[PDB]
Amino acid sequence: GPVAESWCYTQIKVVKFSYMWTINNFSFCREEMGEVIKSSTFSSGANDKLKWCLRVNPKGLDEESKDYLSLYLLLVSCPKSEVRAKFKFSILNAKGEETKAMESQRAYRFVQGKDWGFKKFIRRDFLLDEANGLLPDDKLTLFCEVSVVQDSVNISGQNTMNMVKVPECRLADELGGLWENSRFTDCCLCVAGQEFQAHKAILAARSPVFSAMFEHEMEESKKNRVEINDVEPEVFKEMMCFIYTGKAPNLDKMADDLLAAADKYALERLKVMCEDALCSNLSVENAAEILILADLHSADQLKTQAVDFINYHASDVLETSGWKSMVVSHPHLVAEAYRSLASAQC
Amino acid sequence: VKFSYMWTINNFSFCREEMGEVIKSSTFSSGANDKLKWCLRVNPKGLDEESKDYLSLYLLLVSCPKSEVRAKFKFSILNAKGEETKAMESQRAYRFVQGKDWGFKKFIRRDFLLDEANGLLPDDKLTLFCEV
Amino acid sequence: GPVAESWCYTQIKVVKFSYMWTINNFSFCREEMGEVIKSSTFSSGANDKLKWCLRVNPKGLDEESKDYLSLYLLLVSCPKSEVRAKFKFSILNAKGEETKAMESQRAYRFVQGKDWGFKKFIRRDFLLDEANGLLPDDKLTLFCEVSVVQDSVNISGQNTMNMVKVPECRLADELGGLWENSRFTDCCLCVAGQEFQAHKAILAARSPVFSAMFEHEMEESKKNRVEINDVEPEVFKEMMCFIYTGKAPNLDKMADDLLAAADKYALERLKVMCEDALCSNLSVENAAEILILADLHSADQLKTQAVDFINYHASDVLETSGWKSMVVSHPHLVAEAYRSLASAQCPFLGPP
Amino acid sequence: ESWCYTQIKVVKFSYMWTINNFSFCREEMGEVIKSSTFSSGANDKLKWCLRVNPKGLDEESKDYLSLYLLLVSCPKSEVRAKFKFSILNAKGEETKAMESQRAYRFVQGKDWGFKKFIRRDFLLDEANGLLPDDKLTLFCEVSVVQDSVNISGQNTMNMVKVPECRLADELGGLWENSRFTDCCLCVAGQEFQAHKAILAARSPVFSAMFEHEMEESKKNRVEINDVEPEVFKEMMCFIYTGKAPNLDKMADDLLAAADKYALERLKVMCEDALCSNLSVENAAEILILADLHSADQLKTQAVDFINYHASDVLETSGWKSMVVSHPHLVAEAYRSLASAQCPFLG
Amino acid sequence: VDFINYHASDVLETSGWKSMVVSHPHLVAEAYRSLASAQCPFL
């Protein structure tokens, strides 16, 4: 593969839908042939405007099928002109593996109110057979995989590439490299007895809390020495590193107290990146202090994610001494735990 | 005057259409002239039914200030590693007027491309070496 | 005819437009075995979203249309939506009337570079037969129509049982009645010795020129007596009716003097309707006077359509007495007519 | 509607050249023939040269005489020119000379013509009458068919814009500016300025009180104490503009103002707003207001609503109040409950 | 320079080329040297 003077990359955007659809007590189908069971609407993150609903007929929709479970796919909302897609259906057996996958080799076009699917999907008696385990405890599980493909674009990567080198924006690294040189420092800064020689000009520039704190009746007298004792210098230097370079690479070792510093200094980005570090570090023995830090820092999304962790692991996390401690310390969070596990879950 | 062009198509197994449909590339040229614009056109299916089950490829001239350009082209399909496979040469400097197509209608079989043991369709992608 | 409470008015709105050729010395081209002759890129006319160009072959490609003509429609650029339109083709004679209608029976699909078209459009021997009279100076005229659809929009009702109704606005009707009754008016208005009545409040709010005369110190002392003699009462009554009401019922019979009055008093809306009526009344015999009136009263679109008409019909107006009056009265208009004629239709001796 | 016209003008020129002593020029000089070049076309920019060879250059064309159109330089590099040379009938010749039926493209630095014109011995034989005074005149008229692009005439008409009437917004702006006001309306201390003719045309009550001879004092010193300032500015906004945008939250006392000042259209829209607002709690209140203000259709619709919710209106305390206050409203309610219904079996 | 070296059939026709010839003879010298170095064959 040699190098060409011009090259084109025709890219077609592909988005996928994964979908569960489980019906309990199916033997109480309560209906004759030709009846329908709709589904709730669902989509994905992007663009979240194309909503889809599933239709399943327990008995034969047609006379040629009769003893056939027929499964269709429906579209209800297409604000664009038209979207065409492929689909692949597979029923989960008792163990959970995808069995009897039927898919269409045609990329059928869909309009609002149009259906496609497999009326001749699976035999009724083959479903009712117990040896293959297609009906575990009268619970049928339908796995729906949707391959929606989108408009195609071309980037036109032709040469005459402007051969002189193109640097990126140096607002970040030039500010970062000024810290170790320690130039243009007009004042002092000491935290926990350790000197970190710094100026106020960019420190107030890149944090609105510190600027308002500096300008109100304190830069006239105590601009040289400012009292900051809420954090250790190891977290303070990372906070000023995020101020200067724009990034905080040292995250996983000390996300717990950088979250507290960010909650103190009202830095939402530093709050949520520590939230990302702790959400992947959600565990059974850690969840109590995860809730206490989420509630103390008012991180609603992290708190809700940790409540969902409680919902998924409620069998073994209740007996922890951490949970005994957070009950005897914070009954209110236990009250919202009751509210979430009762009202939202049921 | 020579041309080199890498046209890469992804997710080709999602062919997206039925028989008798065309796919156009981006308009491209070289440094000199950069006034003769060209574009490649492919059919995933057969263009016409006398040569069915084929990947028909043509070269479309879109822009020319003058009338007719003599040009010799040679199509090629890159396999998994990158060699030139199924290299077919148009032996004549064909007659390129504004809006004229030239190519091999019976270029390569659809089933022969779909044979993944040949390595001719790697990662559901096909890229072409076009020299004019 | 039964009626209901609710209505839904979904519709497939069509954008529809036409495209023209007249290939000169067609028998002298001989594009054989698919030699492509393209045309200009053209859009719908309403905005610029899709563009096309037509492709013809006198000797059609392949052995099928060897003795037949091939006719095809090529697509330049469009958003990817599988645009589906119906098209027709025809041949026009020297008299500008359709002769040979061959129409595609379905709305065909279209994409980037797709070429649908009515092949074997006309036999080559019948087309080369000059006895049909459809080739003036060996020119073949092609007329094409297209029926692009943007794939349906719906309106959701709403129109409930709607027990209460509301009347229409009567403001303009009662203001026209105020003018007809001529009540509560304190300022007098003379035209040509026939005396009228109008007040400042309606005049200043709808015309800047009356607003300019009335407020400049005349209203303190001589608010009654006015000096208007450039217009007649027969045009001034319709002027005053349009000022009070906003509507001009009598316009076709008197669009000349009303255009003059609207140009003098800077009534933009009345200038619009007067130019509309005069353009509807435009013809060959009054072309000289409509050019004179439009160029005198600075009617922009009226003089634009006037010069377009005088370029399209230049062969029958020069012999009349109006042109012989124009060439001696307004020498500049001959220069602008020459500038419009020698660049729009016949720029560089094509057509000769 | 485009008049593309595919305009195909040819660049043809007249040319005069006289050949002398053509019978023995082969024995005079030979086969290498060079003639003078001539300039023609667009301002003589195009170069062409015409000459007749008495004998072919190589061995193959020794039989047929050569008439080659030598072309040193092409007009444009890629030209499909179907060239048609002609002879201006010095004798009778329009056939038997091979004229170029199919030509070839002319490029820079290359010549194209035809290598065969007539048999040499047949031309030398004077019995065929092909030697007019031993001199031939050439009239070369090159026909170039390359230029076809273009001529667009959009033939666009658009009719005229025809702007709409803006009189309602003009009167709204006339209120908002308050110019040339003749009367002053004092409402709750705050004084507004309005136009006497506009108020007389819109409302008949103001027209009557501007006509019943109280002119010397009640023009500027008329008092309006029975209304609130915002309901007054809303009803007068309806008087001037023709619309009442804020009517939805204040339809009731605006209906009172419309009743007091004989605004029928404002009365019916305030009737509509309370008509599509009825509930079981305040139905008696709306009926009291409708009967007090003589709102006939709102009264009828309220009576129908009370009839259709007769089980729930009677439970409200407002119903008791209108029972003890207003007898004939209950009488008409009974009349519409009984006379507009019945017989209902037993 | 790459634009000029091909489109010299119209770029050198304009008066700007004669202007930079008469104003900057060293540019003419280096352009002619580059052309002579590039076109080693041909008379």
Curated annotation (Swiss-Prot), chain A:
Q: Which residues form the MATH domain?
A: 16-146
Q: Which pathway?
A: Protein modification; protein ubiquitination
Give a yes or no for keyword GTP-binding in this entry: no
List the subcellular locations: Nucleus; Nucleus speckle; Cytoplasm
Q: Where is this region: Required for nuclear localization?
A: 56-176
Q: Which GO terms describe its cellular component?
A: Cul3-RING ubiquitin ligase complex; cytoplasm; nuclear speck; nucleoplasm; nucleus
Signal peptide annotation: none
Tissue specificity: Widely expressed.
Q: What is the effect of changing residue 178 to D?
A: Strongly reduced homodimerization. Reduces the activity of the cullin-RING-based BCR (BTB-CUL3-RBX1) E3 ubiquitin-protein ligase complex
Give UniProt keywords alphabetically. Answer: Cytoplasm, Host-virus interaction, Intellectual disability, Nucleus, Ubl conjugation pathway
InterPro entries cross-referenced by the UniProt entry: BACK_BPM_SPOP, BTB/POZ_dom, MATH/TRAF_dom, SKP1/BTB/POZ_sf, SPOP_C, TRAF-like
**Consequence recorded when altering residue 117 to V:** In NSDVS2; dominant-negative, increased BET proteins stability
Q: Where are the annotated segments for Important for homodimerization? A: 171-202, 282-340
GO MF terms, alphabetically ordered? identical protein binding; molecular function inhibitor activity; ubiquitin protein ligase binding
Which is one Pfam family of this protein?
Answer: MATH_2
Q: Name one GO biological process term.
A: protein polyubiquitination
What are the residue boundaries of the BTB domain, all occurrences included?
158-282
Nucleus in keyword set = yes
Task: Give the protein's function.
Answer: Component of a cullin-RING-based BCR (BTB-CUL3-RBX1) E3 ubiquitin-protein ligase complex that mediates the ubiquitination of target proteins, leading most often to their proteasomal degradation. In complex with CUL3, involved in ubiquitination and proteasomal degradation of BRMS1, DAXX, PDX1/IPF1, GLI2 and GLI3. In complex with CUL3, involved in ubiquitination of MACROH2A1 and BMI1; this does not lead to their proteasomal degradation. Inhibits transcriptional activation of PDX1/IPF1 targets, such as insulin, by promoting PDX1/IPF1 degradation.
Q: How does it assemble?
A: Interacts with GLI2 and GLI3. Homodimer and homooligomer. Heterodimer with SPOPL. Each dimer interacts with two CUL3 molecules. Part of cullin-RING-based BCR (BTB-CUL3-RBX1) E3 ubiquitin-protein ligase complexes that contain CUL3 and homodimeric SPOP, or the heterodimer formed by SPOP and SPOPL, plus a target protein, such as MACROH2A1, PDX1/IPF1, BMI1, BRMS1 and DAXX. Interacts with IRF1; this interaction mediates IRF1 proteasomal degradation. Interacts with HNF1A.
The family classification in the record reads:
Belongs to the Tdpoz family.
Comment field on protein domains: The BTB (POZ) domain mediates dimerization and interaction with CUL3. The MATH domain mediates interaction with protein-ubiquitin ligase substrates, such as MACROH2A1 and BMI1.
What other facts are recorded?
Antigen recognized by serum from scleroderma patient.
Medical condition linked: Nabais Sa-de Vries syndrome 1: An autosomal dominant disorder characterized by global developmental delay, impaired intellectual development, speech delay, and variable behavioral abnormalities. Affected individuals show congenital microcephaly and dysmorphic facial features, including round face, small palpebral fissures, highly arched eyebrows, and short nose. Nabais Sa-de Vries syndrome 2: An autosomal dominant disorder characterized by global developmental delay apparent from birth, impaired intellectual development, speech delay, dysmorphic facial features, and additional anomalies including congenital heart defects, sleep disturbances, hypotonia, and variable endocrine abnormalities.
Identification of the protein by name? Speckle-type POZ protein
Organism, by scientific name, is: Homo sapiens
The protein's gene is named SPOP
